[PDB]
Amino acid sequence: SAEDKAAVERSKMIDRNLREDGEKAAREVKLLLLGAGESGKNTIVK
Amino acid sequence: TGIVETHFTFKDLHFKMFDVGAQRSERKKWIHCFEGVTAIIFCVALSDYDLVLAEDEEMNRMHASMKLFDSICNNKWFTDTSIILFLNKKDLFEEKIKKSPLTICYPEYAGSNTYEEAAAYIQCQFEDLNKRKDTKEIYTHFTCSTDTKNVQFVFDAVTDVIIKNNLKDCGLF
Amino acid sequence: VGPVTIACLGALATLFVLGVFVRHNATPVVKASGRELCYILLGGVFLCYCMTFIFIAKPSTA
Amino acid sequence: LFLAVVGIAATLFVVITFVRYNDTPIVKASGRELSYVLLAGIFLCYATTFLMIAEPDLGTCSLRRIFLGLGMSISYAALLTKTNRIYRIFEQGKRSVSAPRFISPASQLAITFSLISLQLLGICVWFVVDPSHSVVDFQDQRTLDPRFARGVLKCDISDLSLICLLGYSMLLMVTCTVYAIKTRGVPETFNEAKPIGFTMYTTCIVWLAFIPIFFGTSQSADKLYIQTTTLTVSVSLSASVSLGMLYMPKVYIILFHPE
Amino acid sequence: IVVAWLVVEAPGTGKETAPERREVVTLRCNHRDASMLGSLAYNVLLIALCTLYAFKTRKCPENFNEAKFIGFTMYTTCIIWLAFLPIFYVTSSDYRVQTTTMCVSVSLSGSVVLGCLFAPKLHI
Ligand SMILES: CCCCCCCCCCCCCCCC(=O)OC[C@H](COP(=O)(O)OCCN)OC(=O)CCCCCCCCCCCCCCC
Ligand SMILES: CC(C)CCC[C@@H](C)[C@H]1CC[C@H]2[C@@H]3CC=C4C[C@@H](O)CC[C@]4(C)[C@H]3CC[C@]12C
Ligand SMILES: CC(C)CCC[C@@H](C)[C@H]1CC[C@H]2[C@@H]3CC=C4C[C@@H](O)CC[C@]4(C)[C@H]3CC[C@]12C
Ligand SMILES: CC(C)CCC[C@@H](C)[C@H]1CC[C@H]2[C@@H]3CC=C4C[C@@H](O)CC[C@]4(C)[C@H]3CC[C@]12C
Ligand SMILES: CC(C)CCC[C@@H](C)[C@H]1CC[C@H]2[C@@H]3CC=C4C[C@@H](O)CC[C@]4(C)[C@H]3CC[C@]12C
Ligand SMILES: CCCCn1ccc(N2CCC(c3ccccc3)CC2)c(Cl)c1=O
Numbered sequence A: 001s002a003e004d005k006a007a008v009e010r011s012k013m014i015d016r017n018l019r020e021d022g023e024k025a026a027r028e029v030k031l032l033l034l035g036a037g038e039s040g041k042n043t044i045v046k
Numbered sequence B: 001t002g003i004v005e006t007h008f009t010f011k012d013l014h015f016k017m018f019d020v021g022a023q024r025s026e027r028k029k030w031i032h033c034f035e036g037v038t039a040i041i042f043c044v045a046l047s048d049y050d051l052v053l054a055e056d057e058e059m060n061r062m063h064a065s066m067k068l069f070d071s072i073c074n075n076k077w078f079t080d081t082s083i084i085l086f087l088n089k090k091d092l093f094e095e096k097i098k099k100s101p102l103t104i105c106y107p108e109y110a111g112s113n114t115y116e117e118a119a120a121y122i123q124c125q126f127e128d129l130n131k132r133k134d135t136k137e138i139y140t141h142f143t144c145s146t147d148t149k150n151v152q153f154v155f156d157a158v159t160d161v162i163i164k165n166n167l168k169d170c171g172l173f
Numbered sequence C: 001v002g003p004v005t006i007a008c009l010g011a012l013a014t015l016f017v018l019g020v021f022v023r024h025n026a027t028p029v030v031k032a033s034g035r036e037l038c039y040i041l042l043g044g045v046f047l048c049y050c051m052t053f054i055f056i057a058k059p060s061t062a
Numbered sequence D: 001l002f003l004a005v006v007g008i009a010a011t012l013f014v015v016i017t018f019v020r021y022n023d024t025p026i027v028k029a030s031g032r033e034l035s036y037v038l039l040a041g042i043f044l045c046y047a048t049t050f051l052m053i054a055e056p057d058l059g060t061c062s063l064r065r066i067f068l069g070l071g072m073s074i075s076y077a078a079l080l081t082k083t084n085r086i087y088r089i090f091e092q093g094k095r096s097v098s099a100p101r102f103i104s105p106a107s108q109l110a111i112t113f114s115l116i117s118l119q120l121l122g123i124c125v126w127f128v129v130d131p132s133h134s135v136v137d138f139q140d141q142r143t144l145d146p147r148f149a150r151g152v153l154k155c156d157i158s159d160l161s162l163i164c165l166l167g168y169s170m171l172l173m174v175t176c177t178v179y180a181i182k183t184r185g186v187p188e189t190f191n192e193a194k195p196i197g198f199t200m201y202t203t204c205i206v207w208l209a210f211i212p213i214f215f216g217t218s219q220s221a222d223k224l225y226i227q228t229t230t231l232t233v234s235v236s237l238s239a240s241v242s243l244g245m246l247y248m249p250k251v252y253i254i255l256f257h258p259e
Numbered sequence E: 001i002v003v004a005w006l007v008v009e010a011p012g013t014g015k016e017t018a019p020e021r022r023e024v025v026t027l028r029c030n031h032r033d034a035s036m037l038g039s040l041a042y043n044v045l046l047i048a049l050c051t052l053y054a055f056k057t058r059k060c061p062e063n064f065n066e067a068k069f070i071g072f073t074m075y076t077t078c079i080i081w082l083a084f085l086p087i088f089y090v091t092s093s094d095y096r097v098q099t100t101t102m103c104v105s106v107s108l109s110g111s112v113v114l115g116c117l118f119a120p121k122l123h124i
């Protein structure tokens, strides 16, 4: 249970890394551009 | 050929728009793979209510967008997300508003080709397609040919739905 | 009698708000405030009126 | 004393700012008249506590009546006519055109001291008919069978005198609340319509809770520091809730001058 | 706070006979001033927090804006208890009347909270 304890310690560390990236992903708004092409999408992305 | 996620930040809020479209596959197989989005933006070309697809020779350019817009809002996947409407190239539309009769797109429409009047009827024709509108909101905007000040509207539009989404779960609304 | 009479009237008034709120829960104005915390605040008023009788309550150790 | 020291400092601090910055940035919303006499009344109310409980004798007892009488009757004389003005233009402008003649800084001053003039002639009636006399002690009470007995240094003023004098201010209290309650709809002078209506409700809470204080302590407690120090606190709070709601926000806004 | 104070103190009957040998007081436990001041101190601390938090709720779309009613509740209750100090510290001879003050001020405080907040909502 020596290496297993160290394995759990590594799992806890990367668990925080996934957790902290959750707020960063959730702190950004997501918008979907919809509609036929060549209808003004260029003027709203440049 | 894939999608493009662009980053732009304004007023201390980070945004990550997803340019989905280059995809030429079923799309439906990954339409559900674009949920949890706070809002969607729909771009409409005002000077296309007359143009007709050469290949189809029967479907109008604007009428084609009507079928696509109706399908997007009416599906069960996007029932919990708001709709943002953008109108592109109003200068050409204003030039064609009298040059080309509003009838070309709305034959029922018989009002003066006066821009203000025509713009009002076409705007109201966007939102009367969804069966249920109690939980659906549409934020229509006119932008510009250059669209210099459209960033302010989309910043305000997402703020309205961000607060609304939070209150829906908390039960305050 | 004075404190008891007003407390009895207030206790019925508290039940008036509680009974109406649950009956009219579909109305959006009542649900604008925190519904879960509204009953706690409404309950506290009811406990406030009920505790009024405790100040006399045949005084003893218990 | 705690309210008096901060109150006397607050009223002197606001008046300096209210007059030094006389470029009419936001001060022009209220008239230059009816805003200094009301502030001066609050100054008298705060100064009343300093002079009231201070070496009670024949000289101070006479001074107690005039300063307390003029301290509060002046403050609410301007409040009534300020509230009356707000209702007049709102009522007249709703259907008719323009306002009656008395809406003007020159004419509005005359009626402001008209209510004060009633106290000016009135206060001489009690002063002459029943001059204040420094009672040596009310030794019939506060004396005990054992060797210990001190007494109380009571002044000439009694229940009848203070109630009638305070009654005029109370008479001025109901009329302000009635006028302010009627003009609940948005009247003219937007920036000075809500604080006036909210202050009267706030002030009335102080005096309505003062009823059980007066008829709640004439039984057991000493009549030396309960009918003289509690009364001046209500006077100070009555001015404090009026000075705080009306002038303090203006000072805060004018400090971070937005215009 | 109350449980810790209760453990330190002792709940029981401490009835005493008045030296006047007439109208003996009822079964009294302890002083109501210092043995119970702990609850008052804790409540006052959170009242300021509620008032401070209400200073930012004013900028709300009317229905979510209740700072006007909260301010009145935080002021009317304080005025009741601020003016209650002379009442308790004057009528301290007859116990049947001093205890009546307990049951009236508490009822008034409860009515103010319900009247200021629930009544405007119930009106609509
Ligand atoms: C010196 C001794 C005490 C003096 C106290 C002076 C200050 C308070 C005066 C009046 C009190 C209540 C007024 C509420 C209505 C109002 O004024 O509203 C004003 C605001 C705005 O709200 P709005 O709707 O107008 O939005 C307008 C959008 N622009 O509302 C509020 O939430 C104010 C914040 C809450 C403060 C409540 C009272 C502060 C002290 C409480 C402790 C009392 C202790 C007294 C014991 C001595
Ligand atoms: C608007 C509402 C909340 C006002 C409530 C006022 C209440 C608390 C007041 C109004 C009249 C008061 C009563 C008036 C007279 C007496 C007789 C006295 O020997 C004992 C107290 C008693 C019985 C009072 C108790 C308190 C009382 C009932
Ligand atoms: C915070 C505000 C709303 C509280 C208002 C409470 C009012 C209604 C209560 C509190 C104290 C009460 C008074 C207490 C004592 C007396 C003396 C008695 O011989 C007649 C009734 C009278 C004069 C009461 C009238 C009602 C009264 C003024
Ligand atoms: C200010 C707020 C708390 C409202 C007032 C409530 C309390 C303090 C009021 C209501 C009824 C009042 C009592 C009514 C009647 C009497 C009998 C009188 O001979 C002495 C005062 C005394 C004993 C009053 C003391 C104060 C009192 C108990
Ligand atoms: C700074 C002040 C003016 C804020 C408002 C005070 C109000 C809420 C009143 C209501 C009840 C009051 C307390 C009641 C009883 C006591 C015990 C006595 O030893 C005086 C202080 C103390 C602890 C009082 C302090 C002031 C107090 C807390
Ligand atoms: C701001 C809201 C305050 C709520 N409040 C007010 C008073 C209060 N006491 C009742 C009277 C007691 C007391 C005892 C002796 C003299 C003065 C007072 C002290 C404790 C509680 Cl326990 C409370 O909870």
Ligand SMILES: Cc1ccnc(Nc2nc(-c3cn[nH]c3)c(C)s2)n1
Binding pocket: D206, D207, D208, D209, D210, D211, D213, D229, D230, D233, D234, D237, E079, E082, E083, E084, E085, E086
């Ligand atoms: C009606 C009312 C409301 C608020 N306040 C007062 N006046 C008071 N004055 C004192 C006091 C000052 N020194 N000693 C006692 C109190 C404890 S409450 N009245």
